[PDB]
Write a protein that binds this ligand. Sequence first.
Ligand SMILES: O=C(NCCCN1CCOCC1)c1cc(O[C@H]2O[C@H](CO)[C@H](O)[C@H](O)[C@H]2O)cc([N+](=O)[O-])c1
Ligand SMILES: O=C(NCCCN1CCOCC1)c1cc(O[C@H]2O[C@H](CO)[C@H](O)[C@H](O)[C@H]2O)cc([N+](=O)[O-])c1
Ligand SMILES: O=C(NCCCN1CCOCC1)c1cc(O[C@H]2O[C@H](CO)[C@H](O)[C@H](O)[C@H]2O)cc([N+](=O)[O-])c1
Ligand SMILES: O=C(NCCCN1CCOCC1)c1cc(O[C@H]2O[C@H](CO)[C@H](O)[C@H](O)[C@H]2O)cc([N+](=O)[O-])c1
Ligand SMILES: O=C(NCCCN1CCOCC1)c1cc(O[C@H]2O[C@H](CO)[C@H](O)[C@H](O)[C@H]2O)cc([N+](=O)[O-])c1
Lengths: 103, 103, 103, 103, 103
Amino acid sequence: APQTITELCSEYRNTQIYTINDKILSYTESMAGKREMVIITFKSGETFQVEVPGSQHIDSQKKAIERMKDTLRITYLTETKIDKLCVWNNKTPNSIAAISMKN
Amino acid sequence: APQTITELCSEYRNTQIYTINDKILSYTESMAGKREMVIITFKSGETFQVEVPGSQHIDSQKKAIERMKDTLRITYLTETKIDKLCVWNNKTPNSIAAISMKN
Amino acid sequence: APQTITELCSEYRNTQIYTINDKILSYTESMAGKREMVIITFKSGETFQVEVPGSQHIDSQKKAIERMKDTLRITYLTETKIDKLCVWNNKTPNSIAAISMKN
Amino acid sequence: APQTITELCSEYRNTQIYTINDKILSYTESMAGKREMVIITFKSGETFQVEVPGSQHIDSQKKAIERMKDTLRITYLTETKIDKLCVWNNKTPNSIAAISMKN
Amino acid sequence: APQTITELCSEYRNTQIYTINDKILSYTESMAGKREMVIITFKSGETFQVEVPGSQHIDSQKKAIERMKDTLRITYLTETKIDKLCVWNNKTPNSIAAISMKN
Ligand SMILES: O=C(NCCCN1CCOCC1)c1cc(O[C@H]2O[C@H](CO)[C@H](O)[C@H](O)[C@H]2O)cc([N+](=O)[O-])c1
Ligand SMILES: O=C(NCCCN1CCOCC1)c1cc(O[C@H]2O[C@H](CO)[C@H](O)[C@H](O)[C@H]2O)cc([N+](=O)[O-])c1
Ligand SMILES: O=C(NCCCN1CCOCC1)c1cc(O[C@H]2O[C@H](CO)[C@H](O)[C@H](O)[C@H]2O)cc([N+](=O)[O-])c1
Ligand SMILES: O=C(NCCCN1CCOCC1)c1cc(O[C@H]2O[C@H](CO)[C@H](O)[C@H](O)[C@H]2O)cc([N+](=O)[O-])c1
Ligand SMILES: O=C(NCCCN1CCOCC1)c1cc(O[C@H]2O[C@H](CO)[C@H](O)[C@H](O)[C@H]2O)cc([N+](=O)[O-])c1
């Protein structure tokens, strides 16, 4: 198994590592029909999404998708600094695949 | 996908943005039969609900309605200030579709 | 839908509002068969329960009961003041139907 | 329904009330197969468990057990004082049936 | 049942105890297909994972795995000291079987 996020990220196509080194600036969450997602932004101006669960996801990614949204909400509320994000760049906003934080 | 709550809100009929910029003043939660809902208020007098899950909701919203109430409760308890609410105004009190927070 | 817990509570029979305006003095949780419940008490001597899920409850009340026990646990832990309780008074200890909290 | 942890504890066979009135010293959590359990210890010497789910539990006890582990984790992390524990003494280490915490 | 994590660890083959006595240095989480896992590292250089659920895991272990990720994120967030880790050493990074924390 991978041992860092850089590594996990280079196993997939259309992705990229973003070095954040910052807390989340805004948290957006929606429960509207077909728009059940989370958007975050940074002071740098970047915007990321956790995508609405869809046909592109495998079954084992569904619980992971709710956990990610859980993680982002709590990271926002505690002002925890995020280290890196591994994101899919064929979407807009770019879509979160993985996250890392370090103390 | 949408990049902000406002853009997401304007994909729906019967919605409107309230710019709150404030901590929730009060939190109500009910488990009584047919009234399984949350009600929040602001220092302004604005009252909002998370509707009781129903016929108007599609399957993918069911987890999202539950996430939304988890969000409103921890927001209330931490005194986190809400930025904007995207709400349906064909309900009374108005019904939340999406919420955003900024630090 | 109702806009306050008092209005909400008044839609049911065998219910009354308790105005607490105080933090929970003790929290009790049980996983014992047939007594899967939470009990809370106040410095006033008042005692209240979240009842065991039973044939009195309908379908949609199942997650709400779990949410209400989660809420009482975090309210206890953060020493958050409860404003009112809407309870069913045909049970002892009286049974929580709804909770509000003001900040 | 019972009104305190002691009345509730008296309804079962093989139980006993421990009045610890102290935080949890250590928290151990396992996901190893057939040992999916929580163990806690206190300064005064005792060691208690949350049993691995099994046929001795009825169906409404499955969610209760998960809740109980949730509670012991947060209680540990916050140093919340546990007042009493209703435990079954026909297991080793003794097994949690109920806990109480007080202000 | 085992009374400590070292007694529980030694019931399993291909396991060993890591005495960390330290707070988690980095927390990594991924929702990418087939890498639905969590990775933690320590100031000492040590690196550990929560494997992706698979056929080596029995159903009772599926909930325990979600529980273990939940525990690592909140442990990370609150800077809590991890006392010991019981890990499977036939995997890289080594895989968490059990965790323990004290004061
Ligand atoms: O490039 C991909 N996989 C390539 C193999 C990587 N590898 C898989 C086996 O174990 C080790 C890691 C790969 C790309 C994927 O990509 C797609 O779905 C994503 C959401 O997951 C995003 O929506 C992304 O925009 C989209 O293009 C999806 C999956 N998937 O959800 O199964 C795999
Ligand atoms: O305005 C709607 N359609 C607008 C399309 C926006 N959407 C973006 C993604 O691509 C699909 C279309 C729209 C209105 C809806 O409306 C209704 O349900 C809401 C709760 O869901 C509220 O209760 C609202 O008061 C009620 O009128 C419901 C849905 N729905 O639950 O599926 C869509
Ligand atoms: O909560 C109930 N919901 C079922 C229908 C609810 N309905 C829609 C919303 O506004 C008013 C009434 C409901 C609760 C009722 O109350 C009963 O169940 C409760 C738990 O739900 C309590 O245990 C209470 O002690 C018990 O007497 C009785 C009836 N009944 O006789 O129909 C309905
Ligand atoms: O928890 C039990 N609840 C089921 C019945 C509850 N009872 C119904 C009426 O209101 C008062 C309490 C119950 C527990 C019992 O105890 C058994 O299971 C427990 C876990 O739940 C512990 O593992 C304990 O060590 C074990 O002996 C034994 C019986 N029994 O031998 O019949 C019932
Ligand atoms: O080999 C295993 N069990 C077999 C023991 C059966 N038993 C042997 C002697 O006594 C009488 C009968 C066995 C191997 C295990 O290990 C396997 O799965 C683990 C996760 O569960 C890890 O992924 C690990 O790396 C992998 O080897 C784990 C378990 N487990 O978590 O239950 C059991």
